[PDB]
Amino acid sequence: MIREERLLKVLRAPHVSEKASTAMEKSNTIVLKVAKDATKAEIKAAVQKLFEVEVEVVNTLVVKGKVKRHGQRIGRRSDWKKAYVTLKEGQNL
């Protein structure tokens, strides 16, 4: 069993975009920003515990951060992990 302490840290934010929206209303899939070191197993456990929904499967990818200038002052944004969480049919969030 994954500690609840751990599960409470792994989900960071919902991800809002046209693709995320289409994923929700076509494939019953929610898109999350999750902790960089979160595994598919942890992500599944967290969503089922914290959002109280049945998860079919988690797909994940690492987004590489862009380089961005800030008044002639350059800096690289952090890489972050995105999770496409497919909910079982009948579940809603």
Per CB under 8 A, does 5 bind other proteins?
yes
Q: Are 18 and 62 in contact (CB under 8 A)?
A: no
Which C-beta is closer to other proteins: that of 40 or that of 51? Answer: 51
For residue 59, give the amino acid letter. Answer: N
Tokens 């089922």 belong to 48
Is 40 within 8 Å of 84 (Cβ atoms)? no
Tell which phi-psi region holds residue 28, choosing left (phi > 0), alpha (psi between -120 and 50) or beta. Answer: left
Sole binder of RNA in the list 16, 71, 90, 92 (CB under 7 A):
71
41 binds, among RNA, other proteins, none (CB under 5 to 8 A by kind): RNA
Site for other proteins, rule CB under 8 A? 4-5, 8-9, 11-14, 33, 50
Site for RNA, rule CB under 7 A? 1-3, 6, 41, 70-71, 73
